[PDB]
Short mmCIF file of C-alpha atoms and ligand atoms in Angstrom, two decimals:
data_model
loop_
_atom_site.label_atom_id
_atom_site.label_comp_id
_atom_site.label_asym_id
_atom_site.label_seq_id
_atom_site.Cartn_x
_atom_site.Cartn_y
_atom_site.Cartn_z
CA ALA A 13 49.94 36.36 -1.07
CA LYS A 14 48.27 38.51 1.64
CA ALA A 15 46.68 35.53 3.56
CA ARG A 16 50.02 33.68 3.70
CA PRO A 17 51.21 34.36 7.43
CA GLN A 18 47.64 33.55 8.69
CA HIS A 19 47.92 30.27 6.77
CA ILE A 20 51.15 29.32 8.51
CA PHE A 21 49.67 30.19 11.89
CA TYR A 22 46.82 27.82 11.38
CA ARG A 23 49.29 25.35 9.78
CA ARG A 24 51.15 24.67 13.10
CA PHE A 25 48.14 25.52 15.34
CA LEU A 26 45.93 22.77 13.97
CA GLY A 27 48.85 20.34 13.73
CA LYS A 28 47.52 16.73 13.23
CA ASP A 29 44.04 17.90 12.48
CA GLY A 30 45.13 19.47 9.18
CA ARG A 31 46.02 16.19 7.63
CA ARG A 32 43.06 14.28 6.29
CA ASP A 33 41.75 10.89 7.48
CA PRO A 34 40.21 9.41 4.43
CA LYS A 35 37.60 7.65 6.43
CA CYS A 36 35.96 10.61 8.21
CA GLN A 37 33.00 12.16 6.35
CA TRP A 38 32.72 15.92 6.07
CA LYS A 39 29.79 16.60 8.49
CA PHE A 40 30.76 19.64 10.44
CA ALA A 41 32.01 23.14 9.67
CA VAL A 42 32.61 26.67 11.18
CA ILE A 43 30.80 29.71 9.90
CA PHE A 44 32.61 33.06 10.28
CA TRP A 45 30.62 36.32 9.53
CA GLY A 46 31.59 39.94 9.69
CA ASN A 47 30.91 43.24 7.81
CA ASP A 48 34.35 43.53 6.23
CA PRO A 49 34.53 40.92 3.33
CA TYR A 50 38.24 41.14 2.43
CA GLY A 51 39.07 39.96 5.90
CA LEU A 52 36.96 36.89 5.25
CA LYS A 53 38.49 36.47 1.92
CA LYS A 54 41.91 36.16 3.63
CA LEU A 55 40.43 33.79 6.16
CA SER A 56 38.97 31.70 3.36
CA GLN A 57 42.38 31.51 1.63
CA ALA A 58 44.14 30.74 4.89
CA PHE A 59 41.94 27.73 5.91
CA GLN A 60 43.07 25.40 3.05
CA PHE A 61 44.39 22.12 4.31
CA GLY A 62 43.70 18.51 3.52
CA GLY A 63 41.55 18.17 6.73
CA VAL A 64 40.14 21.77 6.78
CA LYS A 65 38.78 23.34 3.58
CA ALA A 66 37.01 26.79 3.51
CA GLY A 67 34.38 27.62 0.86
CA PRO A 68 34.42 31.07 -0.81
CA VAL A 69 32.90 34.12 0.72
CA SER A 70 29.24 34.74 0.52
CA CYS A 71 26.32 36.50 2.29
CA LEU A 72 23.57 36.04 4.74
CA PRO A 73 20.12 37.30 3.92
CA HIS A 74 19.04 40.61 5.54
CA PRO A 75 15.73 42.52 5.14
CA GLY A 76 16.43 45.74 3.23
CA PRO A 77 13.68 47.83 4.88
CA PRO A 81 24.66 46.62 6.05
CA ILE A 82 25.53 43.46 4.29
CA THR A 83 26.79 40.47 6.29
CA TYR A 84 29.40 38.38 4.56
CA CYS A 85 30.36 34.92 5.76
CA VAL A 86 32.66 32.01 4.97
CA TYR A 87 32.10 28.39 5.81
CA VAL A 88 34.89 26.16 6.98
CA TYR A 89 34.42 22.47 6.52
CA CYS A 90 36.08 19.92 8.78
CA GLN A 91 36.24 16.23 9.06
CA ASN A 92 35.29 15.86 12.70
CA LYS A 93 33.49 17.73 15.42
CA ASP A 94 36.65 17.79 17.38
CA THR A 95 38.49 19.63 14.62
CA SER A 96 35.73 22.15 14.10
CA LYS A 97 36.11 23.48 17.58
CA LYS A 98 39.79 23.70 16.92
CA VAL A 99 39.19 25.91 13.91
CA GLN A 100 36.90 28.09 16.01
CA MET A 101 39.78 28.45 18.49
CA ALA A 102 42.45 28.82 15.77
CA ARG A 103 40.94 31.98 14.43
CA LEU A 104 40.10 33.31 17.89
CA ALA A 105 43.79 32.81 18.81
CA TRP A 106 44.90 34.67 15.77
CA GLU A 107 42.48 37.62 16.60
CA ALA A 108 43.99 37.95 20.18
CA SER A 109 47.49 37.19 18.77
CA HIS A 110 47.51 39.84 15.99
CA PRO A 111 45.70 43.07 16.83
CA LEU A 112 45.46 43.88 13.12
CA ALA A 113 42.80 41.20 12.46
CA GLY A 114 39.19 42.28 12.86
CA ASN A 115 37.05 40.32 15.30
CA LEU A 116 34.89 37.82 13.49
CA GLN A 117 31.73 36.36 15.16
CA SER A 118 31.40 32.54 14.41
CA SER A 119 29.47 29.41 15.12
CA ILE A 120 30.09 25.67 14.94
CA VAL A 121 28.03 23.94 12.23
CA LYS A 122 26.50 20.45 12.32
CA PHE A 123 25.31 18.56 9.20
CA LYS A 124 23.05 15.48 9.32
CA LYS A 125 24.11 13.99 5.92
CA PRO A 126 27.73 14.11 4.93
CA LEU A 127 29.13 16.37 2.14
CA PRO A 128 31.20 15.35 -0.95
CA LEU A 129 34.27 17.48 -0.35
CA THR A 130 36.43 14.58 -1.51
CA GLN A 131 36.23 11.12 -3.03
CA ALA B 13 11.04 36.56 -11.67
CA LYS B 14 11.50 33.19 -13.32
CA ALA B 15 11.25 31.60 -9.93
CA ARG B 16 7.74 32.94 -9.33
CA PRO B 17 5.86 29.64 -9.89
CA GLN B 18 8.38 27.86 -7.60
CA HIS B 19 7.97 30.59 -4.95
CA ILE B 20 4.26 30.24 -4.84
CA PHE B 21 4.46 26.45 -4.55
CA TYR B 22 6.42 26.91 -1.38
CA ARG B 23 4.23 29.78 -0.20
CA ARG B 24 1.26 27.52 0.13
CA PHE B 25 3.19 24.50 1.09
CA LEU B 26 5.10 25.90 4.03
CA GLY B 27 1.92 27.63 5.24
CA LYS B 28 2.41 29.12 8.72
CA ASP B 29 6.03 28.06 8.87
CA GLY B 30 6.61 30.96 6.50
CA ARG B 31 5.78 33.30 9.26
CA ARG B 32 8.25 34.61 11.87
CA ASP B 33 7.34 33.27 15.33
CA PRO B 34 9.61 36.18 16.46
CA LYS B 35 10.59 34.44 19.65
CA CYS B 36 12.49 31.79 17.72
CA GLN B 37 16.24 32.17 17.00
CA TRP B 38 17.84 30.95 13.70
CA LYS B 39 19.93 27.92 14.59
CA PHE B 40 18.86 25.56 11.72
CA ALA B 41 19.11 25.50 8.00
CA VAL B 42 19.11 23.28 4.89
CA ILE B 43 22.00 23.09 2.44
CA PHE B 44 21.13 22.14 -1.14
CA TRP B 45 23.97 21.25 -3.47
CA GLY B 46 24.22 20.15 -7.13
CA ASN B 47 26.05 20.77 -10.42
CA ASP B 48 23.66 23.18 -11.92
CA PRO B 49 23.95 26.84 -10.49
CA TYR B 50 20.99 28.41 -12.08
CA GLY B 51 18.53 25.85 -10.65
CA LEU B 52 20.02 26.60 -7.24
CA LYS B 53 19.75 30.38 -8.09
CA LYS B 54 15.97 29.93 -8.82
CA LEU B 55 15.66 27.91 -5.67
CA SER B 56 17.36 30.75 -3.71
CA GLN B 57 15.08 33.41 -5.19
CA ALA B 58 12.08 31.14 -4.43
CA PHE B 59 12.81 30.63 -0.70
CA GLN B 60 12.24 34.15 0.58
CA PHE B 61 9.83 34.39 3.46
CA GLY B 62 9.81 35.90 6.93
CA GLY B 63 10.33 32.49 8.44
CA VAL B 64 12.59 30.98 5.74
CA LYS B 65 15.47 33.01 4.13
CA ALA B 66 17.88 31.54 1.67
CA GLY B 67 21.41 32.92 1.15
CA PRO B 68 22.93 33.26 -2.27
CA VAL B 69 24.43 30.54 -4.39
CA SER B 70 28.01 29.45 -3.50
CA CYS B 71 30.39 26.57 -3.91
CA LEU B 72 31.87 23.72 -1.93
CA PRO B 73 35.54 23.20 -2.14
CA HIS B 74 37.37 20.45 -3.93
CA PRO B 75 41.06 19.43 -3.74
CA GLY B 76 43.35 20.32 -6.71
CA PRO B 77 44.01 16.61 -7.60
CA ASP B 78 40.35 15.50 -7.62
CA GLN B 79 38.55 15.47 -10.91
CA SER B 80 35.38 17.34 -9.97
CA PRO B 81 32.01 18.70 -11.12
CA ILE B 82 32.56 22.05 -9.35
CA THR B 83 29.33 21.58 -7.17
CA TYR B 84 27.42 24.67 -6.08
CA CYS B 85 25.14 25.14 -3.16
CA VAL B 86 22.72 27.37 -1.38
CA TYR B 87 21.94 27.62 2.37
CA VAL B 88 18.34 27.93 3.48
CA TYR B 89 18.22 29.31 6.92
CA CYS B 90 15.20 28.56 9.22
CA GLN B 91 13.50 29.25 12.57
CA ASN B 92 13.52 25.69 14.08
CA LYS B 93 14.34 22.15 13.24
CA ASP B 94 10.56 21.92 12.56
CA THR B 95 10.68 24.29 9.58
CA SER B 96 14.11 22.97 8.44
CA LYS B 97 12.77 19.58 7.62
CA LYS B 98 9.66 20.93 6.08
CA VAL B 99 11.96 22.94 3.66
CA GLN B 100 13.62 19.69 2.83
CA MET B 101 10.33 18.18 2.04
CA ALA B 102 9.05 21.24 0.17
CA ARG B 103 11.80 21.12 -2.46
CA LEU B 104 11.43 17.28 -2.83
CA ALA B 105 7.74 17.77 -3.56
CA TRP B 106 8.56 20.31 -6.32
CA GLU B 107 11.24 17.97 -7.70
CA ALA B 108 8.72 15.17 -7.99
CA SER B 109 5.99 17.46 -9.06
CA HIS B 110 7.95 19.13 -11.81
CA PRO B 111 10.21 16.64 -13.68
CA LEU B 112 12.04 19.61 -15.31
CA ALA B 113 13.89 20.44 -12.01
CA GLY B 114 17.17 18.64 -11.51
CA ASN B 115 17.15 16.43 -8.33
CA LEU B 116 19.20 18.27 -5.73
CA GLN B 117 20.91 16.43 -2.77
CA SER B 118 20.41 18.32 0.52
CA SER B 119 21.09 18.15 4.23
CA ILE B 120 19.58 19.58 7.39
CA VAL B 121 21.93 21.97 9.27
CA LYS B 122 22.39 22.65 13.00
CA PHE B 123 24.18 25.71 14.37
CA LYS B 124 25.75 26.05 17.81
CA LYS B 125 25.33 29.80 18.32
CA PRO B 126 22.28 31.65 16.70
CA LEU B 127 22.81 33.89 13.70
CA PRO B 128 21.89 37.52 13.29
CA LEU B 129 18.77 37.46 11.06
CA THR B 130 15.94 39.80 11.94
MG1 LIG C 1 41.67 42.23 18.74
#
């Protein structure tokens, strides 16, 4: 529903990257974090392609003595991950509505079983 | 509460790596993933030190067509790559120590930018 235009933006932005190469192992990702969770929720729903899959929204730990929500985006190759980092950054500049998420590229040693 | 014995195992195991070393930035972590949430929950509650902080349990995606176990995971954020591997060992010790605990797969994590954890 609400995350739909954002989805199409990434759809043509990522281009070839969205399609999945069965050989590549899921070893990199992009973590987005902000204070407004529903924004991340729409980001999570938007980044759903064969080649780029976002996990659900969750938190980072903070010592109690404001919650920080985050969403992890998993991508087949390091090249793609940077692209996702740009993709959102473009949307943020493109659409003034969208809040400004901080982010960081993620590097896994051992691959993950996203598929097969 | 139920993850008290597990917490104390790590408390002594990690030793000084549990401390802050405040100069350090958080750019490393360890992702644990398996098919049993509540084991990961207990892990998450156990890993809670000044130098090692675990996020809550979450999932990894799967595609609609794929038959899947609905695997869950927890991130364990750290000071340095030094602590991150130690974390990986710490859990493996507990897994070999206590046969009860299901054997989680895991992976050391590396971040580009530091995360806001202080
Ligand atoms: Mg803006």
